[PDB]
């Protein structure tokens, strides 16, 4: 009874879709994007996140924008069988989850993609077949490393608390996990994964990404996008 | 192909649909409104934003949808609802369109339901106080007087013979869409008699009676 209009390649669309799948909600999803053969240039050449906002229709209500869609889904579907991606607002765990979710959503993925195509010599194993100065790209990638180091320390805390492997903010899969997983998968697509993790660097994050890949929901909604 | 998600009762939805019909665009429209309490009991124009899906683009909000339809469908067969920006007629049409779109329809309808005494012939089977309703109704009368004077100018500029003019000229424009939908909603609420009719605002009265005869207006609304 749900209808979603989205673009497969759209970052925010991927987040919304993963949230739908995690919550075990039957949804009619329509990919408005046209085939590649009709576009003079692929999507990553022309991406505009501000112009590309998915739309959700649930009976009478019509909800634009991905974050609005996710919030509406989290507040509207309170059935006991449907999983919850967010802790109760009264709980002391909600601030942590919300902080990390905001952190991962603030990252400028469009800048990273743009920079990845303009400066392909900074990418490693970029999945593309293949403000504008390289110094700007260097800056934003170092900021990304700071955010990812914060994430690594949080994952280290989680690993300490575990003697049932835990996720980023706890045992339960949360919206912060959705944001982080989609973000890492997009970085992987761009080729910015090797500099940030792997080969003995950020091991907790590497294990996180691998575990995510094995997950049924994530694997059903994603993996086909990269290839 | 075009897809539209809207609410029949929604004011802005009505404007978007009238624009679609006036441009002769084939569109697939879905009424998402439910078949407990009526729509005029609960009103939030900000909550109910229509959405247009045109191939690969998704446009929320009615004004954005209308501007997009005008900028996109540039085929010579498809009529234009706005003059070109370079023209001296475009400022006039844009001013009047903004003037009509600025009106607080939500307030008028909420007050019509709240104060049934003020509606002469409603078609229903500090904002709450009556003074606010009277105040916004007087402002409405001022706006409609501006429209009335513009229509009087149209009458002066048109000869005895020939095609009768619309608000800003001879061609139907977006300002006409806004004005027609506004007048229709006022008639639904019962605020039409106060503003025109019975020798009151004759130019505006004739404008509305001419609107009702338009095939596109009668098909959509």
UniProtKB/Swiss-Prot annotation, chain A:
Membrane-related topology note: Multi-pass membrane protein
Tissue-level expression: Expressed in brain, spinal cord, muscles and intestinal villi. In the central nervous system expressed most prominently in the cortex, cerebellum, thalamus, olfactory bulb, and spinal cord. Expressed also in sciatic nerves and in dorsal root ganglia.
Gene Ontology biological-process annotations: cellular response to vitamin D; mitochondrial fission; mitochondrial fusion; protein targeting to mitochondrion; response to retinoic acid
Native species: Mus musculus
Portion of the parent chain present: 25 to 298 of 358
Function: Regulates the mitochondrial network by promoting mitochondrial fission.
Residue stretches making up the GST C-terminal domain: 129-227
Gene that produces this protein: Gdap1
Subunit: Homodimer.
Name of the protein this chain belongs to: Ganglioside-induced differentiation-associated protein 1
Record domain GST N-terminal: where: 1-81
Cross-link (Glycyl lysine isopeptide (Lys-Gly) (interchain with G-Cter in ubiquitin)): 26, 135, 138-139, 146
Modification after translation: Ubiquitinated by PRKN during mitophagy, leading to its degradation and enhancement of mitophagy. Deubiquitinated by USP30.
Alphabetized UniProt keyword annotations: Acetylation, Coiled coil, Cytoplasm, Isopeptide bond, Membrane, Mitochondrion, Mitochondrion outer membrane, Transmembrane, Transmembrane helix, Ubl conjugation
N6-acetyllysine modified-residue sites: 135
């Amino acid at each position: 009874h749900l209808i979603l209009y989205h673009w497969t390649h759209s970052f925010s669309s991927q987040k919304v879709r993963l949230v739908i799948a995690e919550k075990a909600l039957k949804c009619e999803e329509h990919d408005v994007s046209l085939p590649l053969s009709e576009h003079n240039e692929p999507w990553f050449m022309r991406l505009n996140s501000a112009g590309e906002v998915p739309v959700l229709v649930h009976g009478e209500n019509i909800i634009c924008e991905a974050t609005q869609i996710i919030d509406y889904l989290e507040q509207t579907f309170l059935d006991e069988r449907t999983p919850r991606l967010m802790p109760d607002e009264g709980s002391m765990y909600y601030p942590r989850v919300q902080h990390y979710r905001e952190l991962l959503d603030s990252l400028p993925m469009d800048a990273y993609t743009h920079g990845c195509i303009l400066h392909p010599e900074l990418t490693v194993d970029s999945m593309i077949p293949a403000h504008d100065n390289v110094k700007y790209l260097k800056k934003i990638l170092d900021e990304l490393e700071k955010v990812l180091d914060q994430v690594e320390t949080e994952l280290q805390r989680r690993n300490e608390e575990t003697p049932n492997q835990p996720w980023l903010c706890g045992e339960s899969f949360t919206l912060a996990d959705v944001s982080l997983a989609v973000t890492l998968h997009r970085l992987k697509f761009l080729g910015f994964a090797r500099r940030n993790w792997g080969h003995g660097k950020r091991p907790n994050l590497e294990t996180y990404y691998e575990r995510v890949l094995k997950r049924k929901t994530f694997n059903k909604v994603l993996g086909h996008v990269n290839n």
